[PDB]
Amino acid sequence: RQFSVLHKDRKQISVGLIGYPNVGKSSIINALRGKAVAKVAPIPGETKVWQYVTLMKRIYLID
Amino acid sequence: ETKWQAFARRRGIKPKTREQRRNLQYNPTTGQWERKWGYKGANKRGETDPIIEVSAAKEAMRPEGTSVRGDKRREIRARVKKNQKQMLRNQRIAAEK
Amino acid sequence: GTGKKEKNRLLREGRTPGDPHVKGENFYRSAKKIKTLNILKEGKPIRDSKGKIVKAASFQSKEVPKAVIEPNRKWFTNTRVISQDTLQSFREAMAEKQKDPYTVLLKSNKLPMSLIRDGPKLEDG
Amino acid sequence: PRNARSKRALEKRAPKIVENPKTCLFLRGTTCSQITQDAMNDLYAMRQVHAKRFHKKNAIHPFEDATSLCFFSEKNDCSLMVFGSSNKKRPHTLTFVRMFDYKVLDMLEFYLDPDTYRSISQFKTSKIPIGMRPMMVFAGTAFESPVPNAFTMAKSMLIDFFRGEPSDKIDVEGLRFVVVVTADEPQKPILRLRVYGIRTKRSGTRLPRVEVEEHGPRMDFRLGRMREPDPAMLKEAMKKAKTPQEERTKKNISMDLLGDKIGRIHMGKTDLSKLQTRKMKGLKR
Amino acid sequence: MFKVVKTGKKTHKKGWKRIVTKPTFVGPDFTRRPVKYERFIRPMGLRYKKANVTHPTLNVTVQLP
């Protein structure tokens, strides 16, 4: 929300999640949304493609 | 706000850029650069040309004494008169406000 | 009430009569929203009965424009100039610079960075 | 405004965010004594660059009607007026009149003491260069009254008169003339206007020793009739416009020393006390 | 300059996107528009930041930003 306020001039901000396999990027996105919006599995490489999830009006999350 | 400014604010009409509103254009047929308006502008193209094509019906409907060489100046005078009436209306409205 | 018709909505919202409208305007759709959603529906050319394109699609105009540059005095002047005092102030500022993790960069200032940043080490040079 | 010159004059007389230096109009009534004319000449000499002078007789009583003053402000674009008068009740009067929007903002009368008035030419010293703004010193207890009065308005008009042109920098050689106005609370108090030249002398210290020498003119006034501004006009005159180069401070937005725009993010205190760890099988004895 | 980028899982595909086929300059502090609202596509492999500039008088070629 603070980053969105700092970029209030733009229409929205994109927040992309990076890291090692099986660290919990899709789990973090699902937790922030409060709903299972991204696929989650304990095996590495469950997420294979980039995915947009609209968290709020001006916050997008990129898995 | 004038009538145009209010209408543009309602319709989302964006102001033209300074590069877009320049009094300069490239004429392909002559291969030269010329002005759109003003002295020797594109709005008065052919008033000094040696030969002008004239339609027979247009010449028949043309009043006596007038020629084809002043039609563009007539149209400019009409447009200037309309723009002047509109800006006088805007100034009167702003004076009442 | 007044009525759920579009004209009744226009008089209820008090828009100045005689104004043009974009096709598809309603209570849920403004002109900007209709343009945004019609962008997604763009991309189809207009064709005749034989499939020949009579009107090209958006940004596929196929006509060659006259790519010419006008003579202008602005092309031969310096667009950006900087003074020695300003350069010295920027050098002192960059020497004074300290990194803070809780600050973010929102807009970079267009500066002649090669004349401001310090030189490399003499061993490397 | 058909011509470019008339357009330039209209744009100069147009209202602006930062204003032009105010112009002072020096004019006299039908009766004006020689002492009053000499005082007007001295004030014009103090303010040559931003003043205009009338030379005819004007049958105007400023406290009865000021329509002609408003007309003169309209025509000459003058925001200060020094009006000279002479009468049996008031022998030598200088009426300081300040405009706002080509209408009279406020007015104040000064009565001259004739036996003590000294012109600039009667002092045999070096004089001020043309265009140099003199510094100002206001002394006494009459200027800090809690209620706005005639002395406070006289101070405001004298500041606006000897203000000159604003400047963010000044040469150290342009600190050589001072104008001192002295007035005390109390039978009528006397406002004394003096001008001095400044000499600097070595004192064995980095700060120089300032010595004064009288420059002229020597004026003694008694404050007279008083026209206070309208309240709404006073707030409209005391509205302060904002320069476009003066930025508005945005929350958590700043500019660093290199001109980069910097945002501030705030994390907050890390409170992990209420986090319950996972109760694994290996963590149980 | 622009080529149609077709999107959709049907046989009939939406064609509103365009891609610039010539090198582009995007400038500093560039963040790409999101894919739902990105009509014009300027690929990263075609973005240039420096150029070999020749001075006609000095007869010197320098790579400049």
Add this chain to the structure above:
RNA sequence: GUCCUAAGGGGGGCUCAUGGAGAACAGAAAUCUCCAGUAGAACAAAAGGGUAAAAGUCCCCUUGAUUUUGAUUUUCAGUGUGAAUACAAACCAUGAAAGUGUGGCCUAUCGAUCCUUUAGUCCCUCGAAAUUUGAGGCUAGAGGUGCCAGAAAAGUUACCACAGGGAUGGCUUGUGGCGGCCAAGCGUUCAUAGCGACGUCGCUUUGAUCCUUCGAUGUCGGCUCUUCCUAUCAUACC
């Protein structure tokens, strides 16, 4: 109906309308000379004190017709290297200089065979007759989108259906681009300009670093099996 290297800006020089006296045509009124001429002329505004070695009028220079930068002001931006805008700075023009000055002004659109409105008393008709209101026809006028009315009939079908129409090439290969120089030669030799192979010169780590992989609209395969080309990896010879 014509004419203009446009307006504007800067600098320099001169003084105007008018009156008197004079000069072949020239005679109230042509042109020229002197004297007197606070502007009584011209240029702008609407002074109750605008301008006289000028703000008037002629010469010289620019005419580049709307410059660049900005983390700043206001507004806007599904095309966010931001755009318009205000302000500031730089640039520019002129001048010996002090300085001066510019880097725009505006506006929704549509009808004129249209809309609104007025008059006809001695105009005609209301069909059984007359009068008074009213309505229609015809004629003559006035104004011009502030007070001349009005200008709001959307999508989707991957659930589908019908009537039809369709499904560059004797190209390519092994050697970069831009800019300058040299250059045998081609030309030229009342102009000494212009092309130019062969080349060359500038931009694109002391055997390193490995902590900079830079976007599917375009789609390939696998099996079995036959043949062809050489631009030959191997075997053969040099």
Add this chain to the structure above:
RNA sequence: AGACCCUGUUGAGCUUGACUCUAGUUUGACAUUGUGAAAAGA
């Protein structure tokens, strides 16, 4: 004579402050609706 693409004065199904309607609902008036009193007035 499948599928796919393109065209139509295209047909049909579905949706929505698209247009005109309408079932239903709500509100007002009139008739069904008669008989007396007690006051306030014109």
Add this chain to the structure above:
RNA sequence: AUGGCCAGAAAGUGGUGUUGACGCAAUGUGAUUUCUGCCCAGUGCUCUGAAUGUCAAAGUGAAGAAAUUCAACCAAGCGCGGGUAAACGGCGGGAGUAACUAUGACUCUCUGUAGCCAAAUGGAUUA
């Protein structure tokens, strides 16, 4: 129950209903375990709370010889002004004040190699 939900062209018409809130009807979610990011009040939900501001039909008053015209009056809904399922939705915090109520506005600064606490467990890594 002089009720709701329906059906019927209508009906002295039918169903729920041989029914009566532990019921009937309509929704969303979908065992158990877990579970309700923080705060409101813009859209919407509902308040007979004052108004006639919009205000049809019928009715009332005036002008004319009438056709006709003009005026008040004018229900519901809308509008205005209040509380919310606070559902949708918007909302980076925390302090002050000069505003004084909505909207404020103007400054300041903000980053245990296995524990504690909760009625054995701390789970959704659910048999």
Add this chain to the structure above:
RNA sequence: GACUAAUCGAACCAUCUAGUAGCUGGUUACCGCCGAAGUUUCCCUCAGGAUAGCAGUGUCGACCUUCAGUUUUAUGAGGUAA
């Protein structure tokens, strides 16, 4: 969007009905005399129009006047070679 007699995003039967199509397919003996054309001009375009021009049958008028995608003469443009 499944089923409702092999028929279902609206069953079957008969009628209005020979519904409509600008789209598709087809359109039946012989010989003779002529015989074509693609911005010429105007209109808001595509899902557009007329219109000029070129043609065939009849006639009529004194089928009277004659005219002509040609040259020459003279004068223009091209004064351009020479």
